[PDB]
Design a protein around this ligand. Structure first.
Ligand code: 466
Ligand code: CL
Length: 288
């Protein structure tokens, strides 16, 4: 492949470590980058490295290269997983991205549920809304760069050591029965027009963002538990809408319902959700 000197890091500057994301995002490993910043060559940064598996096909390689090229195009934001570099020359392709040490948002929320399980950390109402605000800001950035996610879900949001929310897996462009690493059905986050008419827009990502809000306020709850694909289809045709979680305000439930508008044009934009969530954070108590 051609050397892009914007992004090239010498192979000997990368110390590869243990695997990370359960295989969900392909072969991803924790690594240490020496002198990632040309400005600071004696500093190590923990990073995530994506590479090809042993029995990888030509398409598999094509998908990895495509994903990296998209991330250069999309550019940098606080609330997305950012490209940091690549090892393209003289060995296997390595794509180097930001490391989020507290894992996906579903895991992060579940680990901070109140005791039954005795957790070491607990989240205020302000913390939950702040999570929602950060995802909305990342999505507003990606939409502004004309990027449609197509799988927005707490499982595709990663949390850093500093509790920053980062949208992942936005750079890649369908078996309705295939389940997640965790055993859930991705069709349960899809807008009806995406599910039935294969039409994917920023508006269908807002619908997914509605399901993600529901995941946040249930602290990593599973949408439509025990509902198979055929029954989900009937629920959507009948216009079913999930119940309001306990410990969720009328205002946040109405935001969820607005994200789930049957008419795509009538859903709020991510620009609108960022403004509304900004106001709500400032007015939400951190005392419980
Ligand atoms: C070039 C495409 O790179 C991609 C694509 C899709 C996902 C990722 C990715 C996956 C996982 C991570 C990650 N951290 C983790 O996966 C993780 C998991 C459990 C416990 C602690 C950390 N930090 N950064 C990542 C980036 C990288
Ligand atoms: Cl999940």
């Amino acid at each position: 492949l051609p050397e892009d000197p914007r992004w090239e890091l010498p192979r000997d500057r990368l110390v590869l470590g243990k695997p990370l994301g359960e295989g969900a995002f392909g072969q991803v490993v924790l690594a240490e980058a020496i002198g990632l910043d040309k400005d600071k060559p004696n500093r190590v940064t923990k990073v995530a490295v994506k590479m090809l598996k042993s029995d990888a096909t030509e398409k598999d390689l094509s998908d990895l290269i495509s994903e990296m090229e998209m991330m250069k195009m999309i550019g940098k934001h606080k609330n997305i997983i950012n490209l940091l570099g690549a090892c393209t020359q003289d060995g296997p392709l390595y794509v180097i991205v930001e490391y989020a040490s507290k894992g996906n948002l579903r895991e992060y929320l579940q680990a901070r549920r109140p005791p039954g399980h005795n957790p070491e950390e607990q989240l205020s109402s302000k913390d939950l809304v702040s999570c929602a605000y950060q995802v909305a800001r990342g999505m507003e950035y990606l939409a502004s760069k004309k990027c449609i996610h197509r799988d927005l879900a707490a499982r595709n949001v990663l949390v850093t050591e500093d509790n920053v929310m980062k949208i992942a897996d936005f750079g890649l462009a369908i078996d309705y029965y295939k389940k997640t690493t965790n055993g859930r059905l991705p069709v349960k986050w899809m807008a009806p027009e995406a599910l039935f008419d294969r039409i994917y827009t920023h508006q269908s990502d807002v619908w997914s963002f509605g399901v993600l809000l529901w995941e946040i306020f249930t602290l990593g709850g599973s949408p439509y538990p025990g509902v198979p694909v055929e029954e989900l289809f009937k629920l959507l045709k009948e216009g079913h809408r999930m119940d309001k979680p306990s410990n969720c305000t009328n205002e946040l439930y109405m935001m969820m319902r607005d994200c789930w508008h049957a008419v795509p044009s009538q859903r709020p934009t991510f620009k609108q959700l960022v403004e509304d969530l900004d106001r709500i954070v400032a007015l939400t108590s951190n005392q419980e």
